[model samples]
Target: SRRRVVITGMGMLSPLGLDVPSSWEGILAGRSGIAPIEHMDLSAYSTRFGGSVKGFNVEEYLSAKEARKLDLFIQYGLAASFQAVRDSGLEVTDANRERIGVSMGSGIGGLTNIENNCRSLFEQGPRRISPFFVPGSIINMVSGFLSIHLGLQGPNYALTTAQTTGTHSIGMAARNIAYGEADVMVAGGSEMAACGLGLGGFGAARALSTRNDEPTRASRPWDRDRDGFVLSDGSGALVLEELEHARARGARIYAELVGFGMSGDAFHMTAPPEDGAGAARCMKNALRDAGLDPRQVDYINAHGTSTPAGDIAEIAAVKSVFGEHAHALSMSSTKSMTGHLLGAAGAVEAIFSVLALRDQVAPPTINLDNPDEGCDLDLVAHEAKPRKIDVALSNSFGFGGTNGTLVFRRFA
Candidate 1:
């Protein structure tokens, strides 16, 4: 009924690694990228650790003068977009430029930059504010920058649905291709959401782990001891193309994005109900969109943020959605390794699901030493598990009770 969408190229920079291969390697190896916060003064903070991208130099994606104007989030987004386009080998010439576009986003985009400029206003007056402040800190600037850099003329947009931003962006990009709005799109999310106001705000809300001494073991999804999510900084991007378009170019296909679904809990501002009704509905909708039975999904990249309530809610949701087949699926949280990338979590986790289908192995949920009561799914525990995974799903739930799910199938 609609054009099929496939992933041709991927680029990601996270605490685990600088690219897909390295990140996937860390995931499979059960490495913990979470560590003590660095490069900032955190002496007065409660939570002192997170997943930080290491060794990233913006000059690789833009000139030093150009990077000076943008903030860290945009720099990461642009770099990830550059990597995806380069990996895709998408030639944007005069003929094809009009059909290529970008959809890059972030949840708490440029909050640190905003904080810095606000402080500047208080200390140095409004006139001292940098002229690039507005453009550098806006959520859609990454999309604009990517479109301009690649000289593409297709749909350019970004979603800001908190942690679900990446999934929504990718899902909408696929819809555009399916409906003939565009043939190719680069879609993903990036974030530098672990500093300044991001920290003080979430910490005040009790959303971050206080295990400052155990950063490596801080993100323990499904574990009874888990306090909260680790706020990590990272970016993930993928080049999505129409099936025939990718085939014609002989592009290497990673996976087919078969379905996307979204829902609103309408229950709370930032918490899901204990029954996970909204999450279950989201999963059911995605399977329906894919024309796939609940039993067909073999793996899940869970939105197990390791928070006390969120973990239990997502498990209950999975059980309600999949029923008896829930036990047959291997579910894990890559956030256990990458921490919570916030807006970028869904895209990076989507990439992990694709790799899981490709390798037929479920990445481990590291640090899950003791399973919380009712958290009885095949959580993949602390080690990678090899299994047959024909279909994989990823879940991303964000603030405002928003939820998103993506279904992916191994490319034939």
Candidate 2:
């Protein structure tokens, strides 16, 4: 028989705050993390603003020398991983180390390093590059370094599935533990792509909002005046363990991870399908896997990035999947406050979903001053709402039309 999986601990580093608790507090208070880009010079870019993480100190988690050897993305993932491991209190003994694994991902890994090194190679010299460059910047290094640090000797995995990286990692990690391949898994995603190439690339694709004059109101998902998503940086981590393993250790269970589903639009590379058929199918698949009806879900953490096309497509998808229950179900986009974390978006949102179950409150979708036509559902606009949410589903879709859904239920 397949084992049951549950999330015991979670960690986050986002534009809203450096840790999970503070970030969730920021979300509940409807505070905006989006602001002007201060890390780099944006004089040459069309989009001058983003949701950049602030006040992160690498020495807080790693030695100065060790931290310097890794890129910012890897550092973010390691810090979040450290928080999660400590939070879970899962002793990694010699006997059980091999039974614990790690799966983390980044959408666009080390773009800053890549860009910097290429400049050094062209302008200075090839020898000017540091030897730690490749290992520090590679996408898989997030999981590789995490496994080494945590002594996780089991399966190690990493993905670069654009914005869906976090959701995919968590889903796949749960699958590993449920199949008895591992008793526990450290999973989530990290990303720091607010640099020159990141902004230039997304701006070229017209994927980022140019609302520089009003960065605070930039990521207005489902709002009529919304422009596009604001680029952000951060990481989120979760410690998932088998139910028996958690029970044996007297661990606190945050929520039960009941179902995970994946689908592909197979329609567009940079845009969603007109009707969001693939997204609808993905949510249906997750609900089916959970063996629950549409009426059972009390809330939804939408992948609403505030883009004109993306927001409408997601509304259509929700309506198609839930039908009449769509109106009754409360859905919100924490991205309205946290901005979009790219590869880390899904995992961070997943934590918020579990928190909604734990606290019995739904975080608000700030700046929903004017909802578009199709977005007629209760968006929990501008303020947190107290409600009994028995189950919540989080949706994540990537640029390649990849979609993933995770279902979390209140532990009885």
Candidate 3:
């Protein structure tokens, strides 16, 4: 039999708040973190608002000298990683150091850093470019930097698959522990790509919400008025350990990661078919892996990016997979409160799912005054719903039609 995996510790840095408890509290309160982008001049862009980390002090995580050398994305990853490790109480000793690893990444790794350095290369003739430019902006450095800092010798790598990066990273980490490759894995994703190029690129593709006058209401998933996803920046990291390993240490188990499934649409680069066949297949695969029936699921943390097409497709997929049971289960989008974290979306949503299992509350989807046509489901509209959730599923569908689902059950 394969080894069992359970979540022992979790951490997050989002626009909602700086830590897990604060973030969850804001979500339950239906607070919207989306606001006008103030760091740069966005007058030329179509979309002018997003969710950025507020009141964050990088010095708290890294020294002033070290902080300036790394990009905002890497800094966010490191901060989340530190919180998770500390929460897990996993002290790195020479004996057990080799049994630990890191798996974290970003959807658009270090876009701000790249943008700045690229400008330097063109205007300053490449001499003004910092030597840390390459290492700071790459995707895998989050895992590499954390491994080097903590002396974790098991596996040091990252996965970058668009918005599914975090979900895939976390799922792959669980697979690693199940395969007996590592006893403990710190896995998740971090991102800060709401920059000049990031905004322009996504806006150029017409993938962002342009409701600048009402930023808070822009990311209205399942709502008839929703335009598109609101960009956000943050990091979400969790500590996963083998069942016996956590039990031996008397760890406080948050939830058991029972199943992970992935699929590729192969139909389009940025769009899904109306039927959402890819997403449906992905959910079925997860249910099968967990040995679960559709009725066994109690709550779902939806991917719901608030995009017109994406929200409808997810609803359609749920109907296809769960049929009549779709109406029975509670589902809502935390993105309505946190905005879209892009790469960090899945990781934070996964953390929220585990917390939902912990606290027994369904986070609210705010700004959904009226549901769109065919968007029929129990959205936990307007307010957090207190309910019993034994098994929860978190879904993330990214560009390139990549879909990933994670199944989490309350630890008995």
lDDT string, candidate 1, 30-79, tens digits? 99889888878888999988999999888777999989889899999988
Q: Relative to the true structure, how large is the alpha-carbon lDDT of every model?
A: 0.92, 0.91, 0.92
Q: Model 2, 106: alpha-carbon shift in Å?
A: 0.5
Residue 330's lDDT in candidate 2? 92
Q: TM-scores across all candidates?
A: 0.99, 0.99, 0.99
* Candidate 2 deviant stretches above 4 angstroms: none
lDDT (0-100) at residue 63 of candidate 2?
Answer: 92
| Clashing pairs in model 1, backbone N/Cα/C closer than 3 A | none
Question: Residue 277 error for model 2, in Å?
Answer: 0.6
lDDT of 3 by residue, 176-242 (tens): 9999999999999999988889999999988999999999999999999998899999999999999
Q: Candidate 3 — worst ten consecutive residues by lDDT sum?
A: 267-276
Model 1 CA deviation exceeding 4 Å by range: none
lDDT of 2 by residue, 1-412 (tens): 7899999989889999999999988999999988898888888999998777899998998899988888899999988888988999889989999999898899998888888888899999999897999999998888899888778898998978999999999999999998999999999999999888899999998888899989999999999999899888999999999999999999999999999999998988879986989789999999998989989989999998999988888989999998899988899999999899999999899999999999999899999999998789989999999998999999999988999999999986
lDDT for residue 175 in candidate 2, whole number 0-100: 92
Q: Mind sharing the TM-score for model 1?
A: 0.99
